[PDB]
Symmetry: D2
């Protein structure tokens, strides 16, 4: 059996598992993790090849669905999360589509939250219904809407919490109880919080999906994703789509991302603490009307955040205090005055970034769509990196004034 | 515009285009092609960000659907093929699934050849019909069967020629005429032949798909794919699925494969010549019942091969002279005796490889499914690489005797 | 001019420059740093090629002595350290040999401390004297020996502080004062401390050398090094040796190392605090005779450590309390009982490591030379990484007990 | 023993060795060669660490002086060349300096040809003499000049053949005889010719050095070098300098180069034949006064080239038929009129390149020194790649006319 990882002592913590969990060392006894850039494998005999295709031996067969470097990434993340099983993908969106596709054929039914990442909303509203799926949307923060949608038989439920940019929350445990009553499996997209700040499995969720592109990489280099869940689910319908539709993670990208996992704990710790300080600063500034951050007392669901998350995260959203007449122009002026923070759409990088949601991601849905979620022309979003917290505050203060 | 590549002089040949086509050099004037390992991009102002997101400027936005290193690979392949447009993918199977997914929603109709790569068969017969597609199979070599299937309105047609592993041929110009009369778009998988030996666009084909994993890489290092076709098709339904379901090619993999394209011409030429000699050797050997190779005069469709191919390829298939009930035992005996050729399930590598399809690549079909395409327990497939031709003939002669 | 980097706002801290200092973005405006795998460059005209070779333009010419990715690593490290100029090398030993060779021809004079890294001692005692250099050794902690050796004109002075494994110190300001009166340039090897815990330039050191292989990488992946000093020295005798003897840094390694520099601050902070706790735990343990760690108040040179260092570092040395005739057996027993920490001779990794110096680190010098410095068969050295401090203490306590 | 490579069948040809020589597959049985990006190694026990440091086991210890991936490159090149031993380096100039330095201390004597690569001349005339070496230069093509210089007991002899750009030759067999009678060791730099067109070891040469940056890579991507000679030389004085001065090859670079070795045979074959055709074209053009290429019958040393080389190489030198006082102006016009070939100083790339030696390659010589070797302002050098030969001839013809 060639896939058994190096054993760790009983009871080690999340940080230890990030540094050395899941390792598969060769006979050369290299300290750091090897990179197997190969698409295929060789066999000692024809009988061994037959047995490998049958599943009687765990010999590697083809990198589209199994590679020794990819195996290290999958096991390390599985142990950090506390999941039964895991499967790596080419991107975060490949993880979302394939996880849902594994649950939903033509004639099946999906109930989802409306406040989603742009591409996740397109998968749920257009792409899967073109293949015969029935999709119903609800406001994620309204349990009576969830209950109404789930009183007919349902195959799957999908949501993100917190949402982006408005940072609205879903009550995880309450929604999972309702979902199970209707026969559905619950898929949670956990990119905003990371596995350090929010754990869905102890709250009854069936499947958790990640983007590796964001905090896991941590430095903006490559793309990747992962699907996490039950052994039966991962080895069954998920494996089948992965093998035959081929949205496969590169062994090079796996190497980058498994090395990113070693410093995840300390990077999230520092950025969470920095974002908390920055939200408090913005909350006292005379040029600012309101701030949204889950661990700030002004948040409408502050009390729920304190029970289901261990920190607020690495993103702060806020509105400028000016007439709506000049709000777009004022927001543009603020972005253009930054000297340290870069103007960019991404999240989860060591470099700090700023964006104007209303004219980028949410420009499609138009004025009516935006006003329904409270997203005005004066709203700005900042993604907090690893720069000195006082250097960041100085750049923001100068940009506002 | 940042995306216009360095123009080559008029009338330059395929070899020249493979070495220097599609380049986009930076201000540093590097001779060799740069690798942009980034997931996102920055903007000079909030206005430029808004316009870029709207597609009003050609500034890069997010690497899941556009990256400067991926663009060099796409353009280089487009020019070698003679196609209107191209989109890179995570694997050859992601190119197959996504190309057909862009043409077929629930309620649409596909006519396909039966003689296919294992995973392509699974896509056509199980995966797409689960999402509501109606699939009809035919024997690719029977034009009267094509005629009967295409006598009603049809959305898509799919086939490989020559087929993997039986090397059955499909008359491209003739099937295309029938498909267009039914309103269908024709997708050709051109992996076995490569762009050097067979060109489908001059014969009326609408879409060509490739696996980068095979001859394009040439040395068995990484996975990749491509979809080639109309600007309307590539930029429309193809781009929608790519952006939102995310089976994205890594910028690292793109670098490996675009460098592989520089040597494709000379590598195919050498391996085509070597395969032809090996096929002639096998055709005279006492232990061999038959040989299938398109440029051997003994091939049942030799005349059609001469019509639509400039060479036979790099793979040789043969059957052992042994009754069917004990043929597996004899095949295993032969493969186990090889000392230079590796036992492996792959092709298109500089290293020569051998496999037994009935117990590996086509095990899933079952005894009845294999019988329908003529694939018995006595069949053996050899992929020919760059080693000395007489060294390879020596290893095979010894293994058979 | 193509080599001018993106300038940062006035007054930014060491943490901020490590994240985004020294970047040179292309016209594609990529967020993350690009990798230019090229050996050569091209020119728009013959006149430009002539000017470029004559050094009248700053256009790149050949990667053995200048490359755009290598320049980003050089400038980021130069910004962190506060040096006038920098040059990257293939390894730390390449930095040591080339820096000293730049100052020392046949007939020139070197004064060096005796307590050095194995390979550094071989360079000073054997390799340079074979080429005509006069080398005199002193005990690093004895200022009266420094005074006597530096009472005649001298070209170079070389030492490490703290030393490895006994962690003896050299008084930087006092030795620098004596060296300058003799006309000599002071070369400090600062690998043990890192630029985060000890800074030589404000104390009047002329040259600082680094191995990138250790804390700079931080995860045990690649080799590299650097030389930092005055503009005339780096561009003069150093440049000459680098161009023509060619111990060049690879652009791939340069990308690995520059991204490592982004997390250096938080990695060193955490490992230093962890090592302080481990030193205190060992100091109080009944199986332990003595501990050596510079920020432990019992260190014989504690007041000097507090004067020139801001933390003790990430390595802890100790001796077992047992009779010397059985100490080797006892040391081997302890190493063999570790179940989390790996047995290995390396330093500066996120993975914690343990070694026995008398049979590894300091094998060459024989038993008489080891006794001279107090390095008995009962001495053990631990390199502290990023695992949970409680999990590491548990592993050490089980191994001792 | 972990270092013994997979031996190939007896008597296999050079093409087969290039594809498969020197591999060391892991227990995962990867088809393609693995990349070990590690600086250090771990041990099973303290007793294994001790024996590994003592050289009693061949267990890897530290990547500055041994790594599994670097070993595959070393062994594959050694087998192609037919040498007793091999050691990889950071660049070709590192191979030159380290090979000579291992033979030459203060007081030792070197006899070298004058017509050397620029950096090679600096090593011999300035760098080594600064460290106490006596160096004497001769005209490489004059055997009596060799004979006089070698009547004094000598330690080392160094030369290149053919020279660049004038392509004069040295008689390998004759010079080697004269050197051995002086007790000297012969170092041949074989970069211009490659291992495939000229073999030094059968003619009594003691040491051969290579730059991997040129034809070995073949695509202009990375730097590297190698030293080949007797086992006791490689494991003695060479190893000592490599371990302690550290001009180390990166494991990433070693993967690039070992894979380029698989296609070396067919790439050299195609480029050599192409250059032959191009030399013949130029030799008949009305704008051209003369041509230098070793396999052109009108070369002044044609008979010698036929005796010691199997082809002329991939570089073509020529001079314009114009008055000397306008020659620089005319040459500049020709370079600036090219539309396919790039203006660049490099060699051995699949991309074809053009250079003007008098203002680049040989700038640091002055009018006086260029006249001595016949290098006028009208001389142009072309490096031939893998583009279609008739596409290259078309560009050159238009540029001349």
């Amino acid at each position: 059996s060639v896939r058994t990882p190096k054993a760790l002592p009983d009871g080690v913590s999340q940080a230890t598992v990030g540094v050395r969990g899941g390792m598969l060392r060769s006979g050369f006894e290299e300290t750091a993790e090897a990179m197997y850039l190969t698409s295929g494998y060789v066999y000692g005999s024809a009988a061994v090849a037959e047995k490998s295709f049958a599943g009687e031996l765990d010999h590697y067969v083809y990198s589209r669905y199994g590679n020794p470097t990819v195996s290290v990434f999958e096991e390390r993340l599985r142990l950090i999360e506390g999941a039964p099983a895991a499967f790596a993908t080419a991107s975060g969106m490949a993880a979302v589509f394939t996880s849902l596709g594994a649950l939903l054929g033509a004639g099946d039914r999906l109930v989802a939250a409306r406040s989603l990442f742009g591409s996740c909303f397109v998968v749920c509203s257009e792409i899967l219904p073109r293949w015969g799926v029935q999709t119903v949307f609800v406001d994620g923060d309204d349990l009576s809407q969830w209950e109404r949608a789930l009183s007919v038989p349902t195959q799957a439920v999908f949501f993100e919490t917190p949402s982006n940019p408005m940072q609205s929350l879903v009550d995880i445990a309450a929604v999972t109880e309702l979902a199970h009553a209707a026969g559905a499996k619950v898929v949670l997209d956990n990119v905003f919080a990371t596995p350090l700040l929010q754990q869905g499995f102890p709250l009854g969720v069936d499947v958790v999906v990640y983007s590796g592109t964001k905090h896991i990489d941590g430095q903006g280099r490559v793309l990747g994703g992962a699907i996490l869940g039950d052994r039966e689910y991962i080895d069954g319908p998920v494996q089948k789509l992965m093998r035959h539709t081929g949205p496969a993670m590169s062994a090079f990208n796996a190497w980058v991302l498994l090395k990113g996992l070693e410093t995840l704990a300390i990077r999230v710790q520092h950025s969470n603490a920095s974002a908390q300080r920055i939200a408090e600063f913005l909350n006292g500034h005379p040029s600012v009307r309101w701030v949204r951050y889950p661990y700030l007392p002004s948040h409408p669901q502050y009390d729920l955040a304190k029970r289901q998350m261990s920190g607020g995260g690495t993103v702060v959203t806020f509105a400028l205090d000016c007439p709506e007449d000049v709000a777009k122009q004022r927001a543009f002026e603020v972005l253009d005055k930054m000297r340290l923070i870069d103007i960019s759409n991404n999240l989860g990088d060591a470099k700090s970034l700023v964006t104007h949601p209303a004219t980028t991601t949410h420009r499609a849905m138009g004025p009516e769509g935006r006003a329904a979620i409270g997203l005005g022309d004066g709203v700005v979003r900042i993604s907090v990196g690893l720069e000195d917290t006082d250097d960041l505050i100085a750049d923001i203060d100068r940009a506002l004034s």
